Structures are given as structure tokens and as C-alpha cells.
């Protein structure tokens, strides 16, 4: 599909048992999800934007549904007001940038 | 152009007869440019973003050229980490996300 910009670009996405709403964020390295207690080993991190830096942990290789679209990647934890789908996923479902 | 996202989104502007690279952020609803001297009026605002909130000089109507495309909008100039493009100015030249 062809999301224009208008608004911001939410899409739905599922991580297990969990859908939720996220941007798909051309401005972001990483994956970033808001706050959930996801199984496995992670390690720490921190990030920046603005504002400053939040801590985040790193999970490795975590499906992810985006759109029906299916990805698999490292996805950071931590205290975002938003999910975002950074590029490590857009990537992998095929997200162009067109002007 | 189409632009792939292995790698970041970063692009020549030209502002004020100056070149800067800037980030083309889907994520991000304002441009915020790093600091820099612009003309005439401006207001004092502020914004969120993933770390905090940040004061930022909001300036209207300032062109940009963003790749060869010609924008008129709003800059928003403080402490952001990067260059960022948001939808304000992605809309006005045309850019859309594409899966
Ligand atoms: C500033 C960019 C260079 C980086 N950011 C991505 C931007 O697209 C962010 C995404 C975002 C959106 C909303 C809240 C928090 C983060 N966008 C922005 O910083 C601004 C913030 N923002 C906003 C608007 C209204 C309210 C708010 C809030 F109240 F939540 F602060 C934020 C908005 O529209 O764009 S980032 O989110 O900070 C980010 C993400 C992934 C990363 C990373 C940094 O480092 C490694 O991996």
C-alpha cells in the first residue's frame, strides 16, 4: 500500500498475544515498543531524540507482524509514548520512502 | 526518487543559501533543524520527543528546499540530536511510505 503523510503513519502490528498501534518511523535506527514483559534474554541500552535519552532493553530476533507483513528482528523495551517501527523492520517488509 | 531505508534517510537541503544534511523523519510531526540564525520573527515553543520536552525558535514560512523540492513552511529550531524533516514539510514535497 501507499501511506501518505498527513497524519501520522499508524499501523497495526502484533507481537504475540499483542496488537498495537505503531509509526512507521523512517527517522528511527532501532525498533522502539512501549513498555511490555517480553520472554527472553535482553541487555541494556540507552537511546536519544529529543529530549534526551531513555533506557531501553534490547530483545534479539522478535517476530513481528506489521500489516500482515511478517519480520523478525531486535526490538528495544522501554518508556516510549509510542511504538515505533524502526528500520531495521522496514526493511524487511519492503518500506520505500517516495517523492 | 525512491529512497530504501538500509541505511538513513539523510538528504541535502538548502536553507537561507546554506546546505545542511537533514534526516527525512516519518516519525516526527515538525521539522526541528539544530541551531542556526534564521530572519525575522519567531516564537518561543516547545516540544516533546522520546527523552523530555525541549524549548525550540519557531519560525514560519521559511523555505527549504529538500532535495530539489521546493517547501514553505514551519521550522521549529533548538536542541534536537539531528536534522529532522517532519511531515509539516514531507507533505509539501510530495513524499509518501510505500510497502
Ligand atoms: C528524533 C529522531 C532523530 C529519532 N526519534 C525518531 C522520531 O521519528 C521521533 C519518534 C517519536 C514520536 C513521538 C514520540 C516520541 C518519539 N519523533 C519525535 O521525536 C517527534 C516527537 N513528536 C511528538 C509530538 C507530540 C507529542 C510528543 C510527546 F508528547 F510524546 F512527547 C512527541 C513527534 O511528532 O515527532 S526517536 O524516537 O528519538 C528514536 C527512535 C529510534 C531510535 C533512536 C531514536 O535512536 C536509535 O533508535
Same mark, same amino acid.
Given at each position: 500500500?501507499?501511506?501518505?503523510?498527513?497524519?501520522?503513519?499508524?499501523?497495526?502490528?502484533?507481537?504475540?498475544?499483542?496488537?498495537?498501534?505503531?509509526?512507521?518511523?523512517?527517522?528511527?535506527?532501532?525498533?522502539?515498543?512501549?513498555?511490555?514483559?517480553?520472554?527472553?534474554?535482553?541487555?541494556?541500552?540507552?537511546?536519544?531524540?529529543?529530549?534526551?535519552? #531513555?533506557? *531501553?532493553?534490547?530483545?534479539?530476533?522478535?517476530?513481528?507482524?506489521?500489516?500482515?507483513?511478517?519480520?523478525?528482528?531486535?526490538?528495544?523495551?522501554?518508556?516510549?509514548? *509510542?511504538? #515505533?517501527?524502526?528500520?531495521?523492520?522496514?526493511?524487511?517488509?519492503?518500506?520505500?520512502?517516495?517523492?
Amino acid at each position: 500500500p501507499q501511506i501518505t503523510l498527513w497524519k501520522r503513519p499508524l499501523v497495526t502490528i502484533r507481537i504475540g498475544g499483542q496488537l498495537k498501534e505503531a509509526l512507521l518511523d523512517t527517522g528511527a535506527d532501532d525498533t522502539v515498543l512501549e513498555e511490555m514483559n517480553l520472554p527472553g534474554k535482553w541487555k541494556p541500552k540507552m537511546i536519544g531524540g529529543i529530549g534526551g535519552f #531513555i533506557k *531501553v532493553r534490547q530483545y534479539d530476533q522478535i517476530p513481528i507482524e506489521i500489516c500482515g507483513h511478517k519480520a523478525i528482528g531486535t526490538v528495544l523495551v522501554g518508556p516510549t509514548p *509510542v511504538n #515505533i517501527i524502526g528500520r531495521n523492520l522496514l526493511t524487511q517488509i519492503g518500506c520505500t520512502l517516495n517523492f
